[PDB]
Design a protein around this ligand. Structure first.
Ligand SMILES: CC1(C)CCN(Cc2ccc3c(NC[C@]4(O)CCCN(c5cc(NCc6ccccc6)ncn5)C4)cccc3c2)CC1
Lengths: 236, 200
């Protein structure tokens, strides 16, 4: 059965026809391990990234690409971010790259900041409820989130959800589950988050946040000894 | 000449200038990521892809670190990557099969020159199709490529016998012999290889 031909026929994207012991104790540990949510309004263009301490175990980077709209950030602006200055020597990055040139420029960013890509995570958008870039050859129905590692050392690499309403730039919350199940550590930073993405276990920094509670020394106290090397998948 | 054609050969050593120009090139390389006909990164970089097209498209299957290396070759060979196809691998019940389990294979899409008359935008960049033998890409890729550029000449590198298609020329060292029907190609092959052997 040809779903590419079906899509040509009917406009139902092939991903519409993808169907479907506990993995829930893990979740409960993540939740109890989680630091309070912390968050800071900051215009990242003008903001010295080094003020964000301590060094992070996980960085989730979600710059507002122009393609999401059909202030925007270009890959020119994103590349100039000094991500290496706030990443721990052994740490991870998750970069939402969209679907166009970001797939290449995001790999350049990752290398610029000292990571190598270990996973390519695809957010596949179904269109069950509503059956073009000039350089595009095909209709683009997915977005990529690249996973990078730097330093020495149960989930799939697909997220399938329905394509959001136009002008909805939100990424699936499923990405947070994938990240948190890795148990990479507890200093987690979400660059260009919003009020709507604030989440326990995470520091959120973005220009549209309406309130802040970030305090550098308060944040660092969450990881004082004996909590210094926890994975976030472990009892207090 | 429209029916399937193929050449058993070592793609490293074949004089691909004899084959002419192609609207679409597809490659599924044995990347070093070795078992068993692996090409080294330099061997890949040195493949004479640039002679095969003037205007058109390249389809390049990548996995692991070849996601980066294939981006390198494609750029070195003179292409811009303008799309990336994802094949979601399913079983017969339409269910999905290092840090994450992999449920997809990637295929880079590159453009060279100023391809005109192609039906961009007919298909979308996600394939859902049942997995068959090990390796072995889904046949949906050929329908996608046919709808995109119908009737035109196409060449596939590192295909296996099951990969041979109408309008395509297939190269690989596990094809059975040489089978050429296009007259311009038969001519250039006989001149370049009067004894039918294909040495370094
Ligand atoms: C899942 C996917 C969609 C499909 C699988 N795909 C990976 C993949 C790709 C191709 C495969 C394949 N191709 C047939 C083959 O003949 C195999 C031997 C090498 N080869 C050469 C090599 C060559 N010179 C190099 C040389 C010659 C002699 C000795 C040493 C080196 N010249 C012409 N052909 C191609 C067969 C089996 C599995 C494959 C898997 C991933 C994406």
């Amino acid at each position: 059965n040809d779903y590419c031909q079906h899509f040509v026929d009917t406009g139902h994207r092939p991903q519409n026809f993808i169907r479907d012991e506990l993995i829930r104790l893990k979740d409960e540990l993540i939740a109890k391990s989680n630091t309070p949510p912390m968050y800071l309004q900051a215009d990242i263009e003008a903001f010295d990234i080094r003020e964000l301490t301590p060094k992070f175990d996980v960085i989730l980077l979600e710059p507002p690409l122009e393609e999401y709209y059909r202030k925007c950030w270009t890959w020119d602006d994103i590349m100039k971010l000094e991500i290496d200055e706030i990443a721990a020597p052994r740490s991870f990055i998750f970069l939402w790259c969209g679907s166009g040139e970001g797939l290449d420029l995001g790999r350049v960013c990752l290398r610029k900041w000292g990571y190598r890509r270990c996973e390519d995570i695809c957010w596949i958008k179904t269109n069950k409820n509503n059956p073009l870039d000039p350089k595009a050859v095909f209709q683009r129905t997915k977005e990529h989130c690249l996973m990078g590692i730097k330093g020495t050392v149960v989930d799939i690499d697909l997220i399938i959800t329905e394509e959001p309403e136009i002008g909805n730039i939100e990424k699936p919350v499923e990405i947070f589950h994938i990240i948190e199940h890795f148990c990479l550590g507890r200093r987690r930073l979400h660059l260009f988050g919003r009020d709507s993405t604030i989440r326990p276990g995470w520091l959120t920094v973005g220009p549209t946040l309406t309130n802040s509670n970030y305090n550098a020394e308060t944040y660092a106290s969450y990881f004082s000894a004996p909590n210094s090397y926890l994975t976030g998948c472990t009892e207090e | 000449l429209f029916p399937p054609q193929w050449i058993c050969c070592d793609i490293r050593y074949l004089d691909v200038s004899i084959l002419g120009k192609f609207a679409v090139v597809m490659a599924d390389p044995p990347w070093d990521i070795l078992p068993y006909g692996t090409l080294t990164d330099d061997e890949m970089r040195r493949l004479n892809i640039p002679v095969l097209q003037d205007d058109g498209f390249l389809f390049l299957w990548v996995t692991g670190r070849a996601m980066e290396l294939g981006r390198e070759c494609l750029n070195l060979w003179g292409y811009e990557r303008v799309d990336e196809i994802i094949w979601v691998k399913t079983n017969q019940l339409q269910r999905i099969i290092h840090w994450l389990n992999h449920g997809k294979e990637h295929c880079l899409v590159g453009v060279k020159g100023n391809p005109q008359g192609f039906n961009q935008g007919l298909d979308c960049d996600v394939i859902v199709a049942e997995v068959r033998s090990t390796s072995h890409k889904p046949d949906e890729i050929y329908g996608m490529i046919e709808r995109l550029s119908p009737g035109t000449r196409k060449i596939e590198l590192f295909g296996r016998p099951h990969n041979v298609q109408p309008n395509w020329i297939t190269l690989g060292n596990q094809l059975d012999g040489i089978h050429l029907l296009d007259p311009d190609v038969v001519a250039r092959f006989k001149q370049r290889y009067p004894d039918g052997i294909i040495s370094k």
